Symmetry: D5
Subunit: 201 residues, 10 copies
């Protein structure tokens, strides 16, 4: 009916710890990094310090409601929802979340979470100061949910800060499948390739 | 009644997670930054470290009470209130809040919140050392509410005399953008901090 | 009562959100700093980084018990008490509290809170390497309680001898700040630390 | 049963404070470190700054369920499980967990927890600049559970970042134990020998 | 009882806010710091950064159980327990607690708590490069409880990293009892003297 | 959605004190009484003691779920439901509910509630002992909701016990609207006229 | 604000244990009985069993709201409300409430509560078979609140059952203020005289 | 696992509102009345007052546990358990439960519940003073769950009945039956208890 | 303080299960039955049905407050207080409490509970139609607290009784009884209430 | 420790649902009925209406406390203790509890629960008006706990019986007995209580 009713129900009945699997189909999560800033780099030790909006999308039908004559969408705290347990496998610091931890929810149950994160990665930074630029690959996927429970897909400069000493040449994202020695099941991930270089003046 | 009553009511009934949209009008949010100190500036990196009191105001009519023979206003923990999900879109460090997270509530339901924040920005440091100075732009709007739910409206006595820097000018302009994709319009306040290194 | 009873009472009924305003009188808070240590000072940037005990004191009658055959005071976690929402007006860093967050409550409802706080300020660092020394002023007052709600009044020997600086003098004085936007005055204590490098 | 049911059962009944000893025989924990990155090294101070994944396995029958027409495993927040109070004996910073604080629970009540941790150790960094390399020993055991209550055992390179300034010669992992003359009791540890060198 | 029952009991009935004074006698606390590492010394600023296990011990009879067919000892989170409010009166950083915040409660009501703490101190670091070394005094006490409510007492190197830049010559720990200028009462305290030096 | 899921969502949401009004329209409550037995009649006081199944119905849309691959209705404690505050205006004993207090909830949010009630009324019993027989009128409406808020409406001896001493000739149920002096708003009630006689 | 909000505010801040004394003065409670039935009379025992509507009315300002775009009234459970602690001083069984225990709150704070009660009294049944009839006095008053805290007032047959064997010749309601020897406080009651006879 | 833990888990995971349906098949409830006494009988009004033990038996897999070194069964208050919403169709007074409202849970999820009920009923008392006695049929079945959600059964088509009664029991037959009403598609399953008894 | 703060403080800190003993000195309970009606007597069976106000009075200084600029008294549900565990040893029905279960709490912590009770007793009804009347004896005291825990005392301090009863009250006297049995080192007390009544003419 | 702390400890860690079984030995429960009055008797229907005190004692170790400088006993509402689920097999009315529902607890975990109950039974009232009298047997045992879990034993087999009953008691014996049933393969234990009574003059 109203904003307050919609948020009450989601709070009271939403099960944060419960992956919203559908008929035991993997939950499909969309992920696209939108880089905003490159804040520090190190060709010697091979580290980068980035700021990026982690465009993260997925469906949770248990959230959906009868719009009809009611709010299009709502803003929900992420404590009040299930959220994918995503990790950047090659981060070497923990996500500084820069933004209000609110996710935007539509009446169908499709969810949009997009926090600004500042994080430090460990990646190939050789060629940063050349014209070829460097290509730093960030791998992201489910920390605890494997192929049959979570799958991850990428999607279809307008963001990047003009005051950065760096400039992006190209950013590309590939779905991937890894396996581990311990474990018979495979995990999926988005491989994000940031090609960037130091500016000329 | 009295304070304890007025504060019990707010705590028992306030719903932090519910924007108080009054009849499907947008919650008007008045914003005004007051810089207190500038601390680290880098014309190479175009990064800055600043401290400012973000003077914020809006109306949550649910909070209202009958002023007749009772407190004009009370102080309240912002965990007991709805608060707009403001974010600085060029911030490169999380906001570090320096002061007690309390806000003031007037009997008419006007909420008045003024945190002291320290945060780092990616902005134009070009010219800080010259006469006409640097102009650093800081953009502040709601992180999840487009212009039908929240609408942000911008409203030296505050700046430390002991700063290494000096403030030529601060100006505030609203900013609205529609896109091909999405029928909702988005708003931010644009804060132009024109400052320079003292003699 | 015993210590358990008295704490339980304070836990159940201390309205930790409610200024213990008496009639409509400002709650009269006393603040008096004692410096333990000056740790890093910048004359260029006008930034000092200091450690100090904030002696705070105020009365809350919802706390009091008849010290009849009872303890005359107890230790109360500040989560379970009303505390003045104080702030350093010229702090450039969030207070680092170095101590257990406990306050002493007297049977008459007198509270004595004294945290050890490490924090950096903007203030006049100049003259630090001179005999007459630098004079760094800190202001501490309520963040939200104007002057009809919370008054503030001010009341070397704890100062570390291993410091690189020394305190020539420390005066503390009643002050109020007002702003053109806002109808109300806010009381503080203006602490003048006169000190110099060794 | 389904994910939501199992999760609720685990949250309602799993007792995070209660070591799941069986027939008072010590709780068998496996700790197996996978080094991801070596980031800083100081041959003067004998300190390393390391990133590893800590494969921690044990067993808690009270989490178990009938997997007849149910999930093989589910994912549970460690706050809703008893976890081993493991601690690095020679650690010089707080463990910085970089990953979702979530563990995997098998229906037979076996728990699979692999946090990704950054932390500094005081250890032997000598020879790092050389072909045979330094050997940094890292010691991990229960902080409060002596060897009648917990044993730690190793499980009876490949993830290390190829963009590290360092590489790995050998990793060996051996059960050991320790006492302190203040106190009667002994504590099992796994001793992780990291044989590495600069590239 | 079993661990399950003993822990449920404590979680249900322990008052972490209530000092376990018995018959208006003070709580005897054994405190004894054991240094593991010395991470950073500055002879200019007079500062050390150190890591210590702070072996802490005291009696809280309300915790006791009859140990007949029962555990002799259990691992309780300290949030379930009253804990002495110990400070280090010349710390310049907050105590960085590095290990799981659990304590040991013996069936007779004895609480054994040993955190590993990283913390920075303001002390005399002159003569660390000498041979008889620097002597860094640290003052440990209750913040809010006087000697009538807490007495703090020490205990009579096996722990210090052999790979430290530095080495410990001696560590001694004596009782001190102190009276401030403001207030009538005394606070019992410990003095810890870290006599140590560089290696070469 | 399973029954487990739906029941959770109802218990947790759903506000038993919140009349399910739509667009400030009256909530339409249907009520058909089904007499099961007449256990006492008295022509002198004019009193009967009856048992009846009170077939009750109304929509509450905050209860609805999409029953795509899911159950069509569920059984729900009325303590977790709003229910109409119906009263017998001419009752002289309190309703003695004989049955489990569970109502049925269809996925379109229709509530089907039907308790077995025993209760005693003040009504015209004259000539229960003749062919044409007594006609005992029972008025039922909401105790606190007027017509704009609630409309109690009727619907249109498959229930009645073959071993009673009485037999039902007729039951008719007609809409009734009533205005009390105190209060200018009007209640919307149902007159149940029970036409029965002794069998002999 | 819709009903569902008003009812939520009431439940969370209605302090049903607290008498809404406004300022100094007592709470003014209107009580007026409406007899529906007389059911069993015993002139030997001086006993009567009676069904009556207890129209009750008072002001709790704490329930108040602004109806501009709001209902004027909602129905509230008395569990979530302060109710006057009324007792019929000459009752000899407990009140059997025959109706839902819901009261009615006006936006200006007035409450209207009107239960149908069956209850037996001790009173003057003599002459119930004569022309002039019997006059049963029923004395209703606060059980714990004396006259400084509660004053009762009536407000100047019509729902009586024609199918009763008795008939009301008259009903009159006056106020009375009674003091007992133990206790220096005066209590108020309404005394309702029920002039009825057998038809 | 002990009694204490088993009961904690049940308490803590209790969904009393969730019919424990397994893969959309109906929950099979057994009902057997074991008559203890007959307190009052009326051939005029066709009413009897009776005390019986109602043995009831169903599965609820959600309560189960591993019974290796664990109790075989435990005692659980019914407010923690889902219970069949059972009801007599011809009852004329509330069921007066005389015993502790406790059932027994077995390790496999079986729930055995047996309350003592005193209740009045409307039935065929004709012939109570004859050689072949009266045959009062009592009909018991779920009030709100139909054929597809609950199915009943008698496990029982001299050890219980009071030797001191004014009546003897000749026979009690219990048969699965069913009941539908024109209003409502779904059939309801019931147990048909024929109490054939006489005055001595 | 206002009434609202006092009731909040009582509700929040009150221990109904806890006898307010002061240093293991016993809680002094005053009792006084003021009879209102006598409703049924039976000389064959020695049974009476009666209604009385049972005035109870005790101290619980843990409920005190500062009367300074406050109310001297407030009403409190008894379900938030400790109450005397009083039983009538010769009752044959359970006590029907006819009145609101509220009590008065005075600012010195004095509690004043007076319920109107209706109960049937097994007592000496003989002589009821004579001029000396019957004397029916009712014994009242704690069910589980011996006399080092609760001391019951009659206040003995007609005005209350129905002018419409068939019966009339000739005198009421109340006296303390106390007994030591050999099993237990403890004396038990009771208050013996002697209702001397006769039928009216 | 004081009463407030013993009661608190009991309230919080008692486990009212959990039978205090030790070493899978039966819990030994001791019921002795003490008769206060006989109120109705009916020779036609074989029914009596009686009032009695149900003396019930057992041991529950989870209640115990060290009673040095402590109360040795406290009074505890039965909601906060495990209580045996006793019932009168041959009862025909609900138990009417006439007394405060408190139980007395000894620091060693010994419990006395003694409600005055009024109830009605089906029993042999034959011979009530003869000099030999009727022998009404009442059976009281655990509803749901068979013999391997609850064992039931009387103590001893006047001072209680009202002098004003129409009736008089001749003897009360009380005897261990065990009833078993077709359906269910465990035996229950009971105190069979033989009331031998008759009418007075
Ligand atoms: C006038 C600014 N202040 C002086 C001291 N306290 C602050 C304060 C406290 C609470 C609210 C506000 C404020 C001011 C303007 C707009 C919004 N809030 N300031
Ligand atoms: C007299 C109006 N009503 C019609 C049916 N219900 C009643 C009603 C309900 C709720 C409150 C009141 C009321 C209360 C005080 C005074 C008058 N009426 N009446």
């Amino acid at each position: 009916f109203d904003r307050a009713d919609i948020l009450y129900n989601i709070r009271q009945t939403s099960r944060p710890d419960v992956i919203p699997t559908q008929r035991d189909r993997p939950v499909a999560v969309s992920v696209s990094l939108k880089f905003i800033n490159i804040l520090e780099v190190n060709e010697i030790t091979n580290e980068v310090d980035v700021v990026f909006w982690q465009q993260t999308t997925w469906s949770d039908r248990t959230l959906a409601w009868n719009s009809s004559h009611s709010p299009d969408q709502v803003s929900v705290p992420i404590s009040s929802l299930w959220v994918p347990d995503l990790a950047a496998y090659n981060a070497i610091s923990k996500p500084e979340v820069l933004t209000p931890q609110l996710a935007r929810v539509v009446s169908d149950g499709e969810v949009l979470y997009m926090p600004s994160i500042r994080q430090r990665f460990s990646c190939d930074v050789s060629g940063v100061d050349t014209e070829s630029g460097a290509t730093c690959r960030i791998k992201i996927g489910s920390w605890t949910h494997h192929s049959r429970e979570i799958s991850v897909d990428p999607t279809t400069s307008e963001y990047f800060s003009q005051y950065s000493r760096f400039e992006i040449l190209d950013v590309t994202q590939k779905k991937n499948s890894v396996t581990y020695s311990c474990c018979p099941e495979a995990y999926e991930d988005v491989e994000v390739s940031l090609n960037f270089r130091k500016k000329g003046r």
